[PDB]
Design a protein around this ligand. Sequence first.
Ligand SMILES: *[C@H](C)[C@H]1/C(=C/c2[nH]c(/C=C3N=C(/C=C4\NC(=O)C(CC)=C4C)C(C)=C\3CCC(=O)O)c(CCC(=O)O)c2C)NC(=O)[C@@H]1C
Ligand SMILES: *[C@H](C)[C@H]1/C(=C/c2[nH]c(/C=C3N=C(/C=C4\NC(=O)C(CC)=C4C)C(C)=C\3CCC(=O)O)c(CCC(=O)O)c2C)NC(=O)[C@@H]1C
Ligand SMILES: *[C@H](C)[C@H]1/C(=C/c2[nH]c(/C=C3N=C(/C=C4\NC(=O)C(CC)=C4C)C(C)=C\3CCC(=O)O)c(CCC(=O)O)c2C)NC(=O)[C@@H]1C
Ligand SMILES: *[C@H](C)[C@H]1/C(=C/c2[nH]c(/C=C3N=C(/C=C4\NC(=O)C(CC)=C4C)C(C)=C\3CCC(=O)O)c(CCC(=O)O)c2C)NC(=O)[C@@H]1C
Lengths: 161, 161, 161, 159, 160, 159, 158, 159, 160, 48
Amino acid sequence: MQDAITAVINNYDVQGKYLDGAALDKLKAYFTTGAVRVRAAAVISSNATTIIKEAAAKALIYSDLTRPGGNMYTTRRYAACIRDMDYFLRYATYAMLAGDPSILDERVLNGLKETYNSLGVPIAATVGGIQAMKEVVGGLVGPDAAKEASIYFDYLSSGLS
Amino acid sequence: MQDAITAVINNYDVQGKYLDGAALDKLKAYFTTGAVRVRAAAVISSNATTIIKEAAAKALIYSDLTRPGGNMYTTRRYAACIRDMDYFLRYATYAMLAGDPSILDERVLNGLKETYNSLGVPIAATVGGIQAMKEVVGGLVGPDAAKEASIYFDYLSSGLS
Amino acid sequence: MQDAITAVINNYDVQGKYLDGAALDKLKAYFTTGAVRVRAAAVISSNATTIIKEAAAKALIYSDLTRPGGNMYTTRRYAACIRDMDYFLRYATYAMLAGDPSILDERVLNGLKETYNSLGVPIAATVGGIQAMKEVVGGLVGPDAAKEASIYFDYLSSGLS
Amino acid sequence: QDAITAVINNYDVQGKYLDGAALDKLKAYFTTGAVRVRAAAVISSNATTIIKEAAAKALIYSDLTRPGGNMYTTRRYAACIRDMDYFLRYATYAMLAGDPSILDERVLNGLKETYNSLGVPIAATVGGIQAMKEVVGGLVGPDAAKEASIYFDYLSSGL
Amino acid sequence: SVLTKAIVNADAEARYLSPGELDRIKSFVASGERRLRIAQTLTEARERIVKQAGDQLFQKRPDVVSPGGNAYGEKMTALCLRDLDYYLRLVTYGIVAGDVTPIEEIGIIGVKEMYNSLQTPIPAVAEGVRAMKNVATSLLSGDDAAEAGFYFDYLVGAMQ
Amino acid sequence: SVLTKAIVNADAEARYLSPGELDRIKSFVASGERRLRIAQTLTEARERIVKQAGDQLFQKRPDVVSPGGNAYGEKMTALCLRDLDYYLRLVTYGIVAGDVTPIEEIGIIGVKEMYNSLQTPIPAVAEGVRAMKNVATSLLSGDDAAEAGFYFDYLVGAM
Amino acid sequence: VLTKAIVNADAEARYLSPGELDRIKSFVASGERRLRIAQTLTEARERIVKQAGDQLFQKRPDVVSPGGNAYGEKMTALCLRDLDYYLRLVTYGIVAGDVTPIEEIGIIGVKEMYNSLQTPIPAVAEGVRAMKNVATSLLSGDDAAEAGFYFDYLVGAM
Amino acid sequence: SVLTKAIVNADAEARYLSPGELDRIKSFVASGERRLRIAQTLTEARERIVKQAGDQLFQKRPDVVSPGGNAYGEKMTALCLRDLDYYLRLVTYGIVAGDVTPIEEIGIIGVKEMYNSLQTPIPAVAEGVRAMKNVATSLLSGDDAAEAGFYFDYLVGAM
Amino acid sequence: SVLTKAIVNADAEARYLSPGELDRIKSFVASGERRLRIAQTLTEARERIVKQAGDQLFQKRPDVVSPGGNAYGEKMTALCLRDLDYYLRLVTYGIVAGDVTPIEEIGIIGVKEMYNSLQTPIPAVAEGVRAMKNVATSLLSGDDAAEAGFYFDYLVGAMQ
Amino acid sequence: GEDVLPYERYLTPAGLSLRKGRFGSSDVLTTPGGITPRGDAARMMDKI
Ligand SMILES: *[C@H](C)[C@H]1/C(=C/c2[nH]c(/C=C3N=C(/C=C4\NC(=O)C(CC)=C4C)C(C)=C\3CCC(=O)O)c(CCC(=O)O)c2C)NC(=O)[C@@H]1C
Ligand SMILES: *[C@H](C)[C@H]1/C(=C/c2[nH]c(/C=C3N=C(/C=C4\NC(=O)C(CC)=C4C)C(C)=C\3CCC(=O)O)c(CCC(=O)O)c2C)NC(=O)[C@@H]1C
Ligand SMILES: *[C@H](C)[C@H]1/C(=C/c2[nH]c(/C=C3N=C(/C=C4\NC(=O)C(CC)=C4C)C(C)=C\3CCC(=O)O)c(CCC(=O)O)c2C)NC(=O)[C@@H]1C
Ligand SMILES: *[C@H](C)[C@H]1/C(=C/c2[nH]c(/C=C3N=C(/C=C4\NC(=O)C(CC)=C4C)C(C)=C\3CCC(=O)O)c(CCC(=O)O)c2C)NC(=O)[C@@H]1C
């Protein structure tokens, strides 16, 4: 994966340039944002189970999906869906700390569409769930953190769709 | 493409053998089936629009696909999907008249899987639609014709999957 | 894989319906056929080597295939072809006991066409061999069993072709 | 192996075809069989309790369970009761079979060495097996108890 | 099902079905007709079994149907009863199959995880299944009840 | 075949088969059984047709079987007869197909180029085919002969 | 049969299921009938072997020919002794209710043994088939079906 | 959007953006704030616009919500209203973009084909859009209404 | 049935069945096998016939399924369809019997009075039967359709 | 772990489609909160 600090380094390395003040400023910018990000991440980790619960309640459950003939019908499928939700949450948290969307592309986004199509999992419903998680997360993290958190959630959603 | 009559001829030609009674019997078998096939083809052509409508209703429409973020969402994509359905129907009809699956391989089947994967069209859903068309077609054509019609539909389905 | 009993169950489970008389009738039908199938399977297992021998004699051997430049020329290729024949026989027997064609799709039929095309094995000759095995099997099993046995052999043949 | 196979094997080494005398031994086993099946069902249903009672008699309220004892810590406690269950299950298998051989082949072979490396106390384990036997004897009832007891004793002697 | 299991073992070994395996298949097909009747009985009595079991469960566990409890409220109580009904349907499927596999795939894998997200207490669910067993046993004849009991016990064992 | 041709035209137009096209297919399937018999007749008489035609050709063209000529010598004469046999087999295929397309792919495309490299005279080959037609016509009934003639004529036209 | 059930249970690490136990009960009841079937074949053993041998030799002249393995008195006796061995194994199988007894004594390493001897395996199979036909005739139909299964297994193994 | 269109024309010509083109971009960015307000107004009133338009449409066309008609039944009537909602959302997108292109891609290409498969009458759909326009116009101020009208008219023209 | 009718006439006259009467019985028994097939066809297509006819009727008469109308509401609409199903069953009975008498006793006597109490419009009911006839005719072969038509027409004639 | 012999743990999506895809997807791929008419007509006939 890549993070903001490494991104700056890599750009300089391809140029072969030693680190310069302009580069330092970009790094400095990240460092200020960092403290906020760490606080947000801790909030998400503690409330992860609840975030998933709330989001599922908002979109997935009490629906045709959970009813027989629906994708999330049967215990095994239900458990799989909530496991997937957790993945999305954990990776988004990783991305938020990193300050880079690349990890999402390298781990989550790559081959997901194809996997889902073979499985028969409904992509639009999954996207709906991700959006729901974003809304719940936004509340817990608070406004400044929410903007940063939202972009990664949206990135996942756009990739899947 | 190839047809049943030509297939027999080609097999003999590679052997270099003159046509023999056993070969003639296969040709004769085709000739009896022919009349039924012609009737079936006319039925399908007249009811093609309805067949597609019914099949879509059975599988595609009223689903995640049609909902926003689904593959068949937006008018353009919806129109594309029904165009593809029509292709499958037309080719299956051609194959049924021919009595040979080869045309399906040469035109429809070759490279479709790869195209669909790049596009992100869901193959299993498409296969579902093909199976639905088969069921509708079976009714209209009647039982004797249905068996013949079914094999080509199944051939398409197996190729895609 | 799936079997007849499980197939009924699965269809009902997706509907969410409790088992009903119509469903019960299908199950009951299977149960009556069961005893015959077990006897047929034992017959096939005991005569498997001979069945393959007879079928090969009918189609494969004394032919261009066995002659130099033919697909089944050389000991290694000959051995491979009879191994494939055995596979088909064993799987058909499994399917007959199960009362469902699914196992054939899951193990034998998946990717076989593509494998054969890369290898340059001739599909029509293989199909011919399968049909020959069916005829031999029909004799040994006896008439009631033969009808049941035939459908699975035909299923394999249709898949390959 | 089993009583039926034991008879067969004895005849096979002689090369003799099965005879009436042999048949009588087989018949003897068949009569005992019904009792054995009933006993096995009783044991399976009461297995958890049998282990509990036996543990209460020997294992618990002891130095073993107290800190510094072999069965101290949850992990070790769980291991000991798992071992007890093994002995019970295998004895039940042996009782149905009518032969002690399975005990030798699976349970008895290498157990002493394993236990010595582990530092598990053999005498305490033997005590537990004997305790289980007593509890089992009650539940199965007298006719079944005699048959059940021999396999328990066999395990104890091996250990 | 019994038959699926036998076939699968054979395929792994890459051999035709063994005589012993074939014999088990024979036994199963003979048993099937009796099994069908047992399943049919429970299906007909399904509505009453669920109702009776529910009442027993609620008496055993007042808390679940209490303002704090998950089951409390009409909507929630219905869902709890629906769950009991689901498990009964699975049990019937099991009896006809002759194996717990049908039950297991639909109901026992990931069950812990699902209920933990829901926050439903697993032990209470187990009690409800036990309650259903008792009701079902009464309607069934003794030998039939024993067969049904095994499947019921498995469920209870799976869920703790 | 007739049917292949119809399907191909439809696919190019990207339309379902026209009623008229369908009617032609119907007519063809009815005709097929008669066509099969015509083909069968020629197959049985094949050996004699080739032999008779060969003789006629050599009488018509002394030069081809002369020291200068390509056909001259046993090996060469055999090859010339083999060619005649090939064309007859193609004609039979055509009759059953109801179209010249099968004939055309195997025999008529690049034929000029092949023979020019060989240096075989194309007109002589045509005469041989004409000769075969006359022999074949005699064995066939008049209406059957007319059907067969069309395919024979096409070959002569092609070369 | 009992051994088989126990072994499956041990693999699963569980006590025997009631259904499994019921099958054991059925087997012990069936055993007495099975013993009678075995007894019948034992009494007819000498004739079964003799008849089967003759059939085999008619079916395969070559085996009892100067080139063939079976040829000569000593060799012919050995061939018949082998047929007798297989019959004894079949009887053991019927009483056991399983092929395992048969399998251990006769079917594992059989190919290797016969290849060293140079005896043709297909001929041996034919002899077993022949024995089956003779045995079937003496047995009652239901008894014959039971016996047939064991005979078929041997033929399949060889 | 306006900007995309300008860039695309420049790229085709392979030139930097012309002064005139740049001026149009400037005008658009100034207009945008006004456009945003117009869009916001319609979004807030969306629920009522759809409801009012639906009623008008059903009064104008009794048939569509009749046993023969496509719209008939609660499920179907909901879908018809959902469609109206979709078109309104598209119109709002158009206003902010300043171009019909956003509207056109999502809603107007393949629309005929989709509705023909559904068997929905296209003219009725057009009437619904007209109805929505009238409701929307009333809430909007006159100048705002004119801007909104253009997008509404385009939709009506497209269907 | 035809046979019943003949017997009844004979009993009134207190005589054995006349040769003419016997001849009619002979004709009927020959016809019966054909009639059975016609009836079987309609029975299989029953569900679809009712559904299609209902839709046609509702299109023809919007009012009946309108807030004022009797048929309006799911419960009422089901009852209207049930009535159509009843009449179809009666028609099948008629075809096998070879006379309208079976139909007549169950459905046509007192029909006016029953519907008037219910307040159901009789003409609408007639239209529904006509609709069912058209659907049934399409599935039946022409000669079969003519036979079926007679029974359908009788119903329509009875109800006005 | 020295006593189990290796078995097939995972497989790729394309491999999975080969085995299961013949006959495609059964299901309509239901979504949450969708208006659907599916099953309605059957329910009406069951009532009648
Ligand atoms: C001769 C010493 C022994 C003998 C020979 C025998 N062979 C056949 C039949 C076949 N033989 C072959 C073998 C080969 N095919 C290969 O590709 C190779 C390597 C290049 C070999 C050696 C094949 C393919 C056949 C099958 C038929 C065919 O040729 O297509 C027979 C006839 C078998 C029958 O029963 O039909 C025989 C008799 N048999 C002996 O007993 C001799 C000691
Ligand atoms: C108290 C909160 C609850 C309770 C406790 C209870 N425990 C026992 C008996 C035992 N508990 C243990 C536990 C441990 N051994 C260990 O090694 C560890 C971890 C270091 C633990 C926690 C053991 C071994 C025993 C057995 C007694 C012994 O020391 O040998 C009892 C007695 C049960 C009896 O009489 O059989 C009780 C009551 N029970 C409750 O109801 C409370 C909620
Ligand atoms: C009743 C004994 C207990 C109880 C149950 C309860 N369940 C829910 C909600 C759901 N339960 C399920 C369970 C299943 N779905 C499946 O696919 C299967 C296997 C076939 C099962 C068993 C599901 C999916 C739900 C989620 C909601 C939905 O219907 O989609 C609830 C209420 C929801 C909530 O917890 O808020 C309840 C109450 N509750 C108890 O306490 C009883 C012990
Ligand atoms: C209402 C004014 C008219 C009407 C509407 C109507 N629509 C449907 C069904 C669908 N309509 C759509 C349309 C869209 N999907 C898109 O992607 C877009 C652009 C964003 C549009 C406008 C779709 C996809 C459907 C299919 C069903 C689905 O949602 O999956 C119906 C019912 C379909 C049926 O015939 O059963 C109706 C009634 N019908 C009228 O008569 C009104 C005039």
